[PDB]
Structure 1
Amino acid sequence: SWHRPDKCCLGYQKRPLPQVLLSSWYPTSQLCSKPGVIFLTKRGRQVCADKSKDWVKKLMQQLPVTAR
């Protein structure tokens, strides 16, 4: 019990994701080494993205944050 593992982004999707493929997003733990956000695609996929990139901050604006 306690101390469950956490989901962290150890790498990033390089090429910008088209919004129409995505449903929402959620931030990773601030304790993760690499600061990242996970985009949830409409297909169901979980994609790691670099929050420093303008395109991702754009998606963060346009998409709603989702709860786990």
Structure 2
Amino acid sequence: LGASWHRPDKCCLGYQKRPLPQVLLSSWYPTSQLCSKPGVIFLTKRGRQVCADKSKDWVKKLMQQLPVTAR
């Protein structure tokens, strides 16, 4: 009961063009492809979000490196 129609918009406006230091990330949650574009935001050991295109090489590569974030 409440903001039930307000789904979690885990989508970002743009993805990071700079290549993250793969190791620096600890996990990656999938951004819904229903938003502007399919993406995966990475959670660093600092809890910082980094939105990336799941269709981008360096993005899928990290996703195959770090596990999926449960949050």
Give 5+ residue unaligned stretches, structure 1.
Answer: none
Distance in 2 separating the partners of 1:31 and 1:10: 13
The percent of aligned pairs where both chains have the same amino acid is 100
Tell which deviates more after alignment, 36-45 or 49-58: 49-58
Single out whichever of 36-45 and 25-34 deviates more from structure 2: 25-34
Cα deviation digits, residues 1-52 of structure 1 (max 9, x gap): 4323412121011011111211000101232112111100111101100122
SS of residue paired to 2:32: coil
Which range moves more in the overlay, 10-19 or 29-38? 29-38
Q: Is contact 1:40-1:46 (8 Å) kept?
A: yes
TM-score by length of 2: 0.82
The count of aligned residue pairs is 68
Q: What root-mean-square deviation, in Å, do the aligned CA atoms of Structure 1 and Structure 2 show? A: 1.4
SS of residue paired to 1:57: helix
Conserved? CA contact 1:9–1:35, under 8 Å: no
The runs of 5 or more residues in structure 2 that have no matched partner are none
Instruction: Give the 4+ runs in structure 1 shifted more than 4 A.
Output: none
Matched, 1:38 2:41: yes
